[PDB]
Structure formats: C-alpha cells, structure tokens
Design a protein around this ligand. Structure first.
Ligand SMILES: CC1=C\[C@@H](O)C[C@@H](F)Cc2nc(co2)C(=O)N2CCC[C@@H]2C(=O)O[C@H]([C@H](C)COC(=O)Nc2cc3ccccc3cn2)[C@H](C)/C=C/C(=O)NC\C=C\1
Lengths: 206, 7
RNA sequence: GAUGUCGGCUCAUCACAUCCUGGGGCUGAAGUAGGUCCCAAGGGUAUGGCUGUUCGCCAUUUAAAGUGGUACGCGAGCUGGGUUUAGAACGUCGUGAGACAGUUCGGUCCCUAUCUGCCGUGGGCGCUGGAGAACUGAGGGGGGCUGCUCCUAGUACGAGAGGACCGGAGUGGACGCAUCACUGGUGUUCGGGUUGUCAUGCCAAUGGCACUGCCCGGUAGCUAAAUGCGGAAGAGAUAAGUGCUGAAAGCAUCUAAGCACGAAACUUGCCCCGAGAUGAGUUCUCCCUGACCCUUUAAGGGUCCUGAAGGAACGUUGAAGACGACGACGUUGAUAGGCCGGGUGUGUAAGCGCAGCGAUGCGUUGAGCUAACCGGUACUAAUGAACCGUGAGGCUUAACCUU
RNA sequence: AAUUCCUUGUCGGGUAAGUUCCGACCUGCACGAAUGGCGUAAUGAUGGCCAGGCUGUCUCCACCCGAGACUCAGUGAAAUU
RNA sequence: CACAGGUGGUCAGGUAGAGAAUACCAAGGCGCUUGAGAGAACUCGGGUGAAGGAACUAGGCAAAAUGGUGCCGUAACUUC
RNA sequence: AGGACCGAACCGACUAAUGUUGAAAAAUUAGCGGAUGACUUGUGGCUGGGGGUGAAAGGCCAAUCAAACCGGGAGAUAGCU
C-alpha cells in the first residue's frame, strides 16, 4: 500500500536478549498530512499528495500557501506522492502516523545517495587498476581501451558524476515502531546522509 | 631507423 | 610523399555451429550417471608451475573453465619479453668481406584532442499571459549466474550394490547497490614520547628545522577486509516438443476449421533517467482588471503612470560540487565562525611542595590539552534598498451562458 | 654446451606442478686442443637459477600530505589546416 | 633565453661526528620576476596500511628491508 | 707495501621514474661505479681529410663522419617524381 516520508536521524545498534546486535537506521516519520487527493476524473490516476515537517512562513511562497490553505493544513518542507492499491481512501488534512508500519514486517526505503562528485573508473565501475610498476607510464588508474579499430558505444563505462541520485534499497526488516516518539527502526543501512529525506513504503517483493 | 619510431 | 607488430595488461562488444545453467525427443534410457539430436545467447564461463609465447603439458579447483568475429578487437590506452638496426661471441657456410626464420648477452615506444563518438555537467531559446510546485510515462537503460546441505526419502527404481524426478527449507561463492552502527585502515588540522641542533637573556618551560625529524596512539570524514539488501515469485504470448476433438482420405491423423499445455529467450512484473514525447502533455495554486497619442490600421508603433506573483544577483554556507548547477539561510535570523557545556582522543600538564647527592619519583591530578562530532548560544558577519520580470493575455470554429 | 636441427633429448634432484636451472648418460645435426683445450681461488654496476628476510609487486586497492589539472585576474605559444 | 646544465684556483667558524659526509646554526647572503582561490577525475613527487607475503611479472623492475661501534664467533674451497 | 678495502671532494654513467613543441638539441631526482692511480685536471703546444687519432666502437676530428667543413669545377647527371 502507500508509504510515508521521513528523515534520516542516524544509525545505532539494538541489543537482543539472545546476545545479538542489529544494525538499525533511525528514521523520524512525523505526522504526514495529505494536501491533495488525485482521482481518474480530474487527474487520470488515483494518488495522494502529502507533506511533512514545517517551513518558514516568511519563506513559503504564495502559490504554495494557496495549495496548503485549500487543504486546511500547515506548510511543510516538501511534497511527495504515493499510488493507491485500488482499495485505499484518504481525505485532505488527514494526518498519517508511523503506526501504518505496525504490521508490514518489511519496507523498501528510498533516498538520495551521497555525493562523490566526479569519480573515476576504479571507484565508479570497480575497474582493475593497471600495474603500478614494470614500465607503466602515466597509465596507472586509466581506463585503457574504449573500443576497437570506430565509435564508442553508448553506455560505455566511463568517469563522471557518482552519487547524488535517487537510490532504493529493498526488503528491509522493521525492527521496532514507536509512534509515541514518531520513529522507525529498520535493520540495515539506507541511502543518503544524516538529515536527508526518506520515502518508506512496504516491501513490494513480498 | 633504430626499430620503433624513433628508437 | 608511412595503414606500427606477436604475446601480455586494461577495457570490451557481437554472432551461435551452447561449455554450464534452462526446456524437450530417441536411447542398446531400470535408478544414479551418461550418449546423441532439437529449442534456447538471459546470465555466467579458474587460479597457478615451465616457457617471450598464443598454443601446449602439468598441479589443483569449478555448475562450467565454450567455439569464433571485431585491422589474427584494443601501443594518439600501457607494456616491449618476442619480432625488427647498429655492439659482441659459439656453431655452420664462405679464401674473404660477411652471412644464417640457427643460437646467445645487451639494446630511446613522442604527440597539450579541432571534428565524430562516448562518459558527465551547464547556458540559451522554445513549448503562445506570466510564475511557483507536484505528476502522468511515449520511450530508453540497469538487473536476470549458481553451488552445497537437510526434509521429501534411504522412499520410487533395483537381485543387490547403489540411489531419484516433482516440491520445500536453510546456508554459501562470485557479482552488484547502498552504508559507517560494529570490526579495522587512513587520519602531515588532536595529544604524548624521544634524538641532534638553533633560538626565546639564563634555570625551568616552549618553539623552529632535520621525510609529519624518527615513533606510539587517535576524533570527524572518506573507506573495505566491515554489515545490510538484491537476482525472484507471478502474468501474457511462445520455441523445440507433447496434446484434445477432427475432416479432406467412411479408417487413421495434434490441424486444414476449432481448442488446451509448454523454457533462464521474447512482452510485463523490480530498480533508475524521463514532456526538447517540437506529437513539447496533465493537475493544484498564485499575480497584474491603467491614460493617451501617431499611423502605409496591424497578433502595429511610441509616451506618461505602473513594476505584481516570482526570479536573479549579492552575502553566510552545505555530509552538493572541477566551474556552472542543486540544497539551506539572510536580524520576523542558529547559515558559518566564535563562545558556553558535553563528548571523544591523548594519558596524571604547568607551577608549587615532598623524598632523593642526582638522574628521577610522589602529591596537587585521570590532571592538562583537545580538529572536522553532539546539544545550545545572535558576540561577529549574513544591511535597508536597487535590478530583471508587467499592466488580463491572438484568429477561426463548435458546444454552452441564452440545455 | 654461449655450440644439439630433431628436442621441453633421457634419468635424477629441486617445486603441489620446473620448455629455464643443477648433476649424470652420449645418440657430438654441426666441441676440440695457442683464430688455444680442460680446470681454476679471487674479482664482476656481467648472464641464468634456487632460498631466508622484506615488502602495496600482487590478491584489491583505501586514505592522507604536497606540485599541476579546475575557477578568477595579467601575459600569451605550438604542430596542424 | 634573466636557460634546473657546464666553468680552474684561494679562504674553510660553532654543536654532534671518524670526517671538507650529514643535521641544525654564525659571519654573510638569499626566498629562485606571475599571483589569488578552490581542494574533482587523472598525472607527477611522497607518507601509512587490515589479513596474506612474489600468488606480480619476460625478470623481485620498482619499493620495502639491511645499515654504526665494541666483544664473541665465522663454512666449502683456496694460488695459503 | 698495495693498478689493496669502505667512503666525500673530484672523475665516471649500471637501473628506474620524470621529461620527450623538455628547465635542458641527452638533463633532472633516487640509488650505483672508481676514488694513490693504466687516476684526474688547468694552461700552452703537435698530428689535417682517403688523412689524422683510436685499450678498436667504424669510434672521435667544433651539436655534422663507411671519408669533416668552406669555396670552386657546377645550372654535375637524373631514361626517375
Ligand atoms: C610502420 C611503417 C609504415 C606504415 O605506413 C605501413 C605498415 F604498417 C605496413 C607494414 N609494415 C610491416 C608490415 O606491414 C612490417 O613488416 N613492418 C612495419 C614495422 C617494421 C616492419 C618491417 O618492415 O621490419 C623490417 C624487418 C627487417 C622486416 O623483416 C622481414 O623479414 N621482412 C620481410 C619478410 C618477408 C617474408 C616473405 C616474403 C617477403 C618478405 C619481406 N620482408 C625493418 C625493421 C624495417 C623497418 C621500417 O622500415 N620501419 C618503418 C615503418 C614503417
């Protein structure tokens, strides 16, 4: 079904009674409020537009204010959408809590990967570095051949921007749900740095 | 002359 | 009036006459395991010893270590052992100079990328009033490997030996994505020890230089050897193949009419880009509701008033970044630095006192110092303005207002 | 064999595995006695081979300090066409 | 070329040291005639490294390692 | 005592990397060799082109050597571009 939007607080460890440590990624899923419900008559598809967090009134523009005022909800730090599973129904202003993940048992987290900037072929594509000696001349960490005896095919593994892109990790175990604190503990590491936004949805693989 | 250019 | 070369390194890509995995027919196929042929190119497809080698032999693995094309792929990408100069010997031929697909030792591989192409990243205009956001997904990429063990079952099979299909569960290798909580690396911006020397007047205490002077530790960050996830199931249409019913041909016949199964291929399902998809889309919201004149009178031109939504610029900046860009903040303010507190690391400072002839030790004292971290704090800097962007948004037609 | 085409000759040793190396056999394609033959301590920036130690040479790269590359201002080339 | 080159002779301080080596200094003389900033790939010149330790490769190329004084002790072979 | 040993100056140039329109028309950096001698070096002098010199490489003789450079024969000749 639909998911929820949160923030990456950081990672810690959870101790069990049997003597096991579970690497968890803490996620602060505050009350997500709906700002727009889309249908097939006006939009062509069924979905909801939600927001979370808060924002400066002196920095929220009037176009955005009118979008929040129409739904009777406070402005947030962004807007995200989720598709409905042909049986779900929501209403504008409805605030969704982390309790939605109380019986899912698994979720697929999505976030913006960290930014490595301009990367090489050894780091980006795990290319094999050439010989550091034995005669190598200025060709220690270079790609080498990029074709044949007259064009470089499309998709050729080269250097370029690495990171700062949308990444999704699948089939993560939900270890704990604390609605009183608006938290969510998922076993394993998720994408992005501390303070980044995370989209949490139930695992679709099942 | 020396083999490869220009060894 | 120059198309540089064997092999190796790196990077690959296509074909199928398929090595493994997958689906089937026959079998002199009992089972296990094999033989042969048909379909199948989605993915996967060894490390080493000797040798310049490819190849090959050998050792040890693997589900398998496929065959070929790509200037016997790839030297404006590397290498230069080999080939392929001048030097020097052996053997051999030659009176000799010298020579030999005979051997042997040694022996300069340059080029700042204009265009194409490719990997990344931006500016401009356009999408027909303008602007700020969320989306639809035409289409395009990525991913698709597999072993072992257990249950099923020591059952079926088989005289025994031996030993399953189907189906299910768990655990691994290789590859890949993300991540830094753990284990660790790095940590010339933290602390300490120590050698030689110079200086701060000197003692003491410090500092500079000697690869960070040489070393032992070590925060953050980055990071793998570290720890989490992933390959799918499912669906649709099929290949070889198996079929049902069924005539032509009173039988028979999988096919001609008709109908149903059928694989890692194909189309979807998962992940990512994505309306420059000029076929330029959809949705929500916000802003502007002036006064005239000239005129070869039109999607016309100019003047005064007006300057919105919003954007840009500037500034403090970022776990964003080559530059642009993207993100946050700008006194109605925690954006950066500083300050406070804590934490972490280093390991008991300095000074004084005590014991000792002294080097030292002890006490004050787990002291002092403490970078990037955590929580707070307007002390400093982020200035009021200005600039860009306008003034209701064409014609035709149709349906509605006035169904 | 600095000489052996056949040939990675054969045997042995060394290695889990040795077309090289060391030691024997002689079947010397095509050794041979001052264009010297066989040995030889010592020497060699000499050639080949095996060990100990050592290490980023490699498995497999990771981080850091600096000089360039990148941006700004100034000066301002080149082959080629 | 205001060019990382080449160019004979003389003078020869201090601490450590065997020393005209080397390190730090004196007298004295210089900072090398473009700078500012950022802190990507890649290149150059360096530092460190988990476990393994030549599996690299034509070849241990390069790098790492060894490194001084004194005493003890020291093989085959040998032209002694 | 020593064409003896280790090792600076000095003289050499074995390896690697860099550089290769270089800082340099052969160098730089890290190592390496000889370092009382067949050593090295300053000044001056001698040997001249089919000749010189050469511990010999076809090596050197003014960044040029299987016959230097300048000038002349000379508008050599070129059945080739
Ligand atoms: C790159 C290039 C021009 C390009 O534009 C065009 C080229 F790429 C084309 C091509 N070249 C080759 C093949 O195709 C080729 O062989 N070479 C190129 C690199 C050097 C090498 C060469 O010539 O090496 C010989 C060497 C003795 C040859 O030895 C032989 O034994 N040759 C031979 C064998 C025969 C056998 C049978 C019948 C006839 C034969 C004739 N000759 C020597 C060193 C010459 C070197 C030289 O002149 N370098 C200059 C470079 C020129």
């Amino acid at each position: 079904m639909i998911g929820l939007v949160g923030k990456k607080v950081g990672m810690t460890r959870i101790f069990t009674e049997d003597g096991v440590s579970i690497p968890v990624t803490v996620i602060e899923v505050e009350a997500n409020r709906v700002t727009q419900v889309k249908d097939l008559a006006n939009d062509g598809y069924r979905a909801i537009q939600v927001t979370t967090g808060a924002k400066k009134a002196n920095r929220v523009t009037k176009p955005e204010a009118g979008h929040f005022a129409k739904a009777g909800v406070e402005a947030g730090r962004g807007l995200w959408e989720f598709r409905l599973a042909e049986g779900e129904e929501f209403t504008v202003g409805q605030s969704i809590s982390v309790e939605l993940f109380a019986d899912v048992k698994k979720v697929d987290v999505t976030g913006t990967s960290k930014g490595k900037g301009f990367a090489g072929t050894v780091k980006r594509w795990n290319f094999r570095t050439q010989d550091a000696t034995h005669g190598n001349s200025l060709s220690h960490r270079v790609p080498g051949s990029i074709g044949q005896n007259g064009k470089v095919f499309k998709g050729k593994k080269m250097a370029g921007q690495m990171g700062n892109e949308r990444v999704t990790v699948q089939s993560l175990d939900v270890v704990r749900v604390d609605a009183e604190r608006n938290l969510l503990l998922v076993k394993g590491a998720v994408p992005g740095a501390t303070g980044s936004d995370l989209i949490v949805k139930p695992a679709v693989k099942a | 002359x020396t083999x490869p250019f220009x060894x």
